[PDB]
Amino acid sequence: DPRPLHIRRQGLDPADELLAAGALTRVTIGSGADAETHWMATAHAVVRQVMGDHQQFSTRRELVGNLMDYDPPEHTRLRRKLTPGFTLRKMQRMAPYIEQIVNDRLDEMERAGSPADLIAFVADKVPGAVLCELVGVPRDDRDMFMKLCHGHLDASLSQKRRAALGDKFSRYLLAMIARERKEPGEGMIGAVVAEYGDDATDEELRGFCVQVMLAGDDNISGMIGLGVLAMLRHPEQIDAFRGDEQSAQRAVDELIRYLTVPYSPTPRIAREDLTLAGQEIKKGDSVICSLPAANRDPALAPDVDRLDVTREPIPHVAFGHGVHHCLGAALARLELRTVFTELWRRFPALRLADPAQDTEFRLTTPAYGLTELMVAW
Numbered sequence: 053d054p055r056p057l058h059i060r061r062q063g064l065d066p067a068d069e070l071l072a073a074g075a076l077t078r079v080t081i082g083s084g085a086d087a088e089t090h091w092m093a094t095a096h097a098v099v100r101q102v103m104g105d106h107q108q109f110s111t112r113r114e115l116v117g118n119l120m121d122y123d124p125p126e127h128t129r130l131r132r133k134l135t136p137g138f139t140l141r142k143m144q145r146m147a148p149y150i151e152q153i154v155n156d157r158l159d160e161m162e163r164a165g166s167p168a169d170l171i172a173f174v175a176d177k178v179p180g181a182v183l184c185e186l187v188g189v190p191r192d193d194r195d196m197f198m199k200l201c202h203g204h205l206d207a208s209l210s211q212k213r214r215a216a217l218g219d220k221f222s223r224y225l226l227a228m229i230a231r232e233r234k235e236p237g238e239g240m241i242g243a244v245v246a247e248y249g250d251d252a253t254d255e256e257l258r259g260f261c262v263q264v265m266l267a268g269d270d271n272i273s274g275m276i277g278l279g280v281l282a283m284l285r286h287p288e289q290i291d292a293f294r295g296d297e298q299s300a301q302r303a304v305d306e307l308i309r310y311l312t313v314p315y316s317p318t319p320r321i322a323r324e325d326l327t328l329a330g331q332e333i334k335k336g337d338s339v340i341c342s343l344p345a346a347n348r349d350p351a352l353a354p355d356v357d358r359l360d361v362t363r364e365p366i367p368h369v370a371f372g373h374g375v376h377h378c379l380g381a382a383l384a385r386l387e388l389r390t391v392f393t394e395l396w397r398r399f400p401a402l403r404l405a406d407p408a409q410d411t412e413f414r415l416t417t418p419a420y421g422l423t424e425l426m427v428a429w
């Protein structure tokens with residue numbers, strides 16, 4: 053394997069080499085004139101210390117509205133400004149909408165008949181539709197909006213195409229923001245402007261939309277796909293999605309902890325010299341935290357390496373830690389819970405279409421996941 057240790061998985065787990073590295077050690081990513089050195093933190097307490105001490109570890113190093121690029125006090129102000137579109141009450145209001153979105157996708161899969169690819173019908177479609185509903189993109193515009201969203205970032209396209217889709221995407225978003233300023237709706241944009249008005253600038257809001265579209269897509273499709281695969285491999289646990297809501301929420305939390313789809317959060321930069329876990333960190337050093345390794349730290353529980361949806365909950369760092377803790381965490385838990393509950397309500401006998409087949413993992417994104425999952429029912 054020529055890939056960095058923090059990118060390695062073995063099935064649903066961290067790779068053994070990644071798990072056996074030190075709590076904090078040096079690594080070099082890349083070669084020749086590209087090669088760089090970083091510290092990699094794999095221990096739960098070290099990742100919490102690094103991520104939680106923003107006075108000591110900065111996330112900077114332009115993109116307006118990208119919260120991850122700022123440090124307090126600038127971060128604090130921007131995050132406060134976007135928070136109205138993510139309150140727990142706004143999430144409760146979204147639930148009916150997310151249930152309809154999931155059922156519409158399940159309907160298409162049902163119509164296609166067994167066996168069918170759960171990744172193409174559900175995992176890769178729900179995330180985007182849910183974000184469109186959150187942002188406030190009108191139904192009939194979603195398909196078009198999503199091609200612009202993905203398109204303006206497709207490295208495979210020429211400068212001329214990417215640029216054209218990008219100019220089209222900004223124009224769509226800016227037009228949406230101006231519409232919302234006039235008559236604020238319940239979407240994210242409308243919630244922010246209703247509270248801040250002109251203080252939330254056009255560029256801030258446009259940038260917020262781009263970043264949210266990015267932050268809540270890959271992590272969720274990876275969790276939908278790896279989550280169904282994990283449950284089908286532990287069938288006695290599926291009942292956690294066939295009971296009350298508490299039961300399902302606890303199963304979703306355990307799956308997020310067990311699978312930790314993001315390999316690492318934004319790299320942290322030491323803003324000064326310090327000693328951490330016995331190592332001497334110097335002003336300017338870069339630190340990469342392995343969230344998957346941290347959520348498999350042995351001190352967390354004697355059976356931390358197993359999936360147990362009924363265990364005593366283990367606080368995890370899959371949504372990060374500190375001021376940058378996932379702003380979309382509540383929506384993510386709700387979305388995943390809705391997907392898994394409606395899935396097993398509709399397909400009680402869901403199973404792998406071919407139990408012998410090798411698993412097709414998605415190894416090219418910032419989040420682990422599946423590229424295809426054939427299921428039958």
Ligand code: HEM
Pocket residue numbers: 103111119120121131186263264267268269271272275308313314316317318319369370371372373375376377378379380381383384
């Ligand atoms: C299973 C799903 C998800 C996982 C595991 C997850 C994970 C993360 C992590 C680890 C961070 C912290 C990054 C850092 O400290 O550098 C974070 C940040 C963030 N996430 Fe999520 N996320 C998920 C879903 C979502 C969704 C559904 C939304 C969008 C509606 C969202 C929006 C964001 C935003 C805006 C930030 C930046 C917060 C800030 O910098 O203050 N995430 N997420």
